[PDB]
Design a protein around this ligand. Structure first.
Ligand code: NAP
Ligand code: NAP
Ligand code: NAP
Ligand code: NAP
Ligand code: KMK
Ligand code: KMK
Ligand code: KMK
Ligand code: KMK
Lengths: 244, 247, 247, 248
């Protein structure tokens, strides 16, 4: 059975991705930072379905002097548990505003650029170095070119992740590793404010769900996507096409 | 009952593979063709051997003219006549040849812009008016790094990106999704010399080979599926990384 | 010897401002027009009062048809007959109106795709065949966030992006640069209610106002200048940030 | 009163051409540099010979670190100290070298992402906070979506710079600060690159089969800071001779 690493897998979109990969027959590494109880509860659910098919792995993905070692350990945890690592899903992400005009700003850089871009880069390095249907899926943002007001560092990090997706697709193609993205628009919100976000969506008659994001990940890691690399699939209900 | 799909230019090559995979997924299919009558009828015969009364052919020229709206309405009508419904439209048919800046030029406009853009637009209109509904447009992953001396073809494929996005927005309230699949190098021309085919294959980072028709069809199957119900206005490159390679 | 420029749709609004600024920069100008004869002639008379024998008018319909290639050849020929050279082509003329998916539709195709894409292509062909040479195409900064029910217009503007890029590549060996200027909200219709105009103006981050025609013309002047001699295939948005604003 | 500009990495090459053309347009200039002190001082001397007290140098490392915010604040402060105003910021300084996926990697992150993205962000913050024709120009890369093999961190940094350009254009528009980019394709090749390798790059360019001069890049910066660009914000102008349009 193939094996996958999902970062930020305890809750929300990462959890849905881990569940759908497991349902597809993958063994999974459930990475978490703060959500140990939720990570272990997910692993317990998946292991009840198929014994010894889910493990957890703790790591802070903030940039620091130790982040490279932390990322090498996440990949190593998959090889140790399952003897292989076929899929990496870079899902974990910090998200909060960083206004240009008025945590230290350098802590915000470490968290926003680290989680959304540098950790994906280091995980990609470790995944490739440790190596079939191998692939990486990066969780992008469908609104990357129509950014949220006062979200500069977040937007910079998601732009950097587009660059990584494309750069790594090119560089890792000779190794047979595909590198793609899934770009949610409005997916799971953290009622009046939620409804303001919902109302913009052309396909809004249909509820946005973590499972719809996971469905695009399942396609990209499947044999039905064996010629697809460097592609970012928007899963946004049309939101990115709506003008101001 | 079984859903129904129209595939334009479905007698051969990528359109044929799309029609076959939709049929294997449980669709009834209208095999549109222009000149390839024998191949269209042979495909319909093969699919009907698998499941009786699940495939028909429909002939039409998709060159632009004052009758193209009637032709496109008739293709959609042929799906309703055969199957009583029309759930999926795949705009695959396409003229492709150079038009250097330095057949009459108006015939070249009619063929290249008609097949790649205006016929998709009119088919989209007729599909929407006659109503998991979706449209898939066959785009081009190289639309922003165009082939030398292919201006009109490239204009047509750019127009098709615009249609995909415009129609996704406008047809969302009707529950019709509109997406694209953008091949890079897929099936090369039968007439192309082996050395020239190999020059194209060597461009592709992922495996130094062209996409099979079936690999292109796999992306179409995903976009029409229940696994894509929140996806509209998206164009999936199926290009092996070709579009990311610099000069 | 003074250089010469053709500006399509130059009688009014943005095209007029482009023709005026080119004239102020030292160009002789062909003022193309379709229906606005009085305004075209008034502009020519103003420019010739400033400098004798520096402006002519040229009437043509730029709707697609069997005669459009000849019409476009004649517009370019009018510049050579008046001024002995043609250094700059500005493709500004444009039909703009909704075409809902749910005039005949083929007339709408001919007008919207003809003015926005096919006439630019044929004018580009004629300009290149007759040869700091450059072409500037008037694009649309909102081409990837289109207006509801404007599919044919949006298809035409997407095709014009493709032409800009294709022609930049193909004409580079001849030293002809091909670029675009993409307004967001510029001049609104006089008859549009101020309440509706203000809805458009409030969308614009930079000053909550539309671009003047002169601000659009400033980008054209840059692109045809010596300060842009390495720039080809580029589309400059002149949109006050509009295209960056989410729904 | 003459306006004033900061140009990062301005001792040599494209940054020097930008500083020179801004100075010729009537700006007073801060020539920021990191290691190229002799070149920076030679340039400042030449500009001050043309017009007294119109050029100063400012040294700073733009690698990311916990002091980078203070360094970036000090570069903007140096323009106010010399000239009493700061009208234009040009983010030109840039580290560029390969980082294969298969110096410590954290140093490479700090240099490549710091110079190309984080320093521009912090300089943008300081420029806005310290505040008419105000604008910022970021030196981008026309090949950002067709990246060089094994340049992932550099490419990530330049993609982040596109995001900053767009984000800052939106957020600073209410303050009348425009934020735009210039995206070279092939411009000045490295001093150390062999001629045969330079010619491989030159032969890629449709328009003239040659690299952009430093002055051609500077011309696009001068347009974007001028009154002829007063409605332009969030735009990235490719100055690439068609390079980005060429398929594999
Ligand atoms: N939700 C949306 O509408 C939306 C829209 C656009 C894009 N996306 C993208 O889709 C992906 C998933 O979105 P989501 O809303 O499910 O994400 P989320 O809930 O905001 O974050 C997912 C997980 O990221 C992990 N994470 C955060 N900071 C971390 C750090 N410093 N170190 C390690 N892990 C850290 C957290 O793990 P722990 O809980 O274990 O600490 C968290 O549960 C993200 O990449 C997001 O940017 C989502
Ligand atoms: N092959 C590639 O490498 C590649 C690369 C990029 C994009 N694509 C796109 O993928 C799609 C399929 O490619 P393909 O290579 O399989 O296409 P193709 O063989 O060139 O053409 C497909 C069919 O289009 C039909 N067609 C042509 N002109 C027509 C007209 N005037 N009226 C009606 N139908 C007409 C023909 O039908 P009849 O045979 O019945 O006359 C033909 O069999 C096209 O949209 C193409 O642009 C392909
Ligand atoms: N205004 C904006 O906010 C805006 C926004 C985005 C893009 N743009 C683009 O900028 C350019 C100028 O905009 P504008 O608002 O000044 O344009 P406009 O007033 O709508 O049209 C310019 C001229 O196009 C000519 N034209 C229309 N149909 C024609 C046909 N069938 N044959 C020949 N010429 C025809 C007309 O000439 P006659 O009057 O002589 O008949 C008209 O005066 C256009 O390309 C437009 O798409 C403008
Ligand atoms: N040349 C091209 O073909 C090309 C192509 C695409 C994009 N661009 C972009 O255009 C801009 C100018 O290119 P260029 O070739 O002239 O650049 P460059 O010579 O490679 O670098 C410009 C300056 O950046 C400074 N710099 C490097 N690391 C630094 C650090 N840690 N801290 C502070 N400053 C640092 C250096 O200053 P010191 O010398 O004082 O140490 C250097 O002189 C860059 O943003 C580049 O990415 C250039
Ligand atoms: N702050 C807000 O007000 C806010 C909260 C959630 C928002 N979401 C709508 C989509 C924005 O991209 C949902 C959303 C939720 N959680 C998220 N978590 C990550 N890591 N990244 C995202 N993009 C994300 N997004 C938007 C704004
Ligand atoms: C008689 O020959 C002709 O009229 C010309 C046909 C095109 N041509 C070429 O050299 C050529 C052929 C196939 C090429 N392919 C690589 C991908 C290009 O997009 C394969 C490919 C195959 N068939 C195709 N059919 C569509 N409708 N559209 C595509 N894009 C297409 N492409 C590229 C260039 C000159 C000869
Ligand atoms: C024929 O029926 C009509 O009069 C319709 C015209 C369009 N219309 C609008 O509501 C409308 C008009 C102008 C609008 N502008 C804002 C920018 C939109 O791109 C101004 C603007 C102005 N004239 C324009 N002319 C070109 N050729 N192209 C542009 N894009 C154009 N645009 C927007 C919507 C419905 C009425
Ligand atoms: C000497 O060892 C190194 O540091 C490496 C430098 C990069 N390198 C290359 O092969 C190389 C060098 C210059 C190249 N240029 C063509 C445009 C690439 O974008 C010229 C160009 C010039 N200097 C540059 N400086 C910035 N800061 N950024 C740009 N992009 C840059 N580019 C391309 C590839 C390997 C050796």
């Amino acid at each position: 059975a193939p094996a996958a690493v999902v970062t930020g897998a305890a809750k929300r979109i990462g959890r849905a991705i881990a569940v759908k990969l497991h349902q597809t027959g993958y063994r999974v590494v459930i990475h978490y930072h703060n959500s140990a109880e939720a990570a272990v509860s997910l692993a317990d659910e998946l292991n009840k379905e198929r014994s010894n098919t889910a493990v957890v792995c703790q790591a802070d993905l903030t940039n620091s002097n130790v982040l490279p070692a932390s990322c090498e350990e996440i990949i190593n945890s998959c090889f140790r548990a399952f003897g292989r690592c076929d899929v990496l899903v870079n899902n974990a992400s910090a998200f909060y505003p960083t206004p240009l005009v008025q945590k230290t700003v350098e802590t915000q850089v470490a968290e926003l650029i680290g989680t959304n871009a540098i950790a994906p880069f280091l995980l990609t390095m470790s995944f490739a170095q440790r190596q079939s249907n191998l692939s990486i899926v990066n969780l992008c943002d469908a609104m990357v070119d129509q950014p949220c007001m006062a979200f500069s560092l977040y937007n910079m990090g998601k732009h950097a992740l587009v660059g990584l997706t494309q750069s790594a697709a090119l560089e890792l193609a000779p190794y047979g590793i595909r590198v793609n993205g899934v770009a949610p628009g409005v997916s799971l919100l953290p009622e009046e404010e939620k409804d303001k976000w919902r109302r913009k969506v052309p396909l809004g008659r249909r509820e946005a769900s973590a499972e719809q994001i996971a469905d695009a990940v399942i396609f990209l890691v499947s044999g039905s996507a064996q010629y697809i690399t460097g592609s970012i699939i928007k899963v946004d209900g049309g939101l990115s096409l709506v003008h101001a």
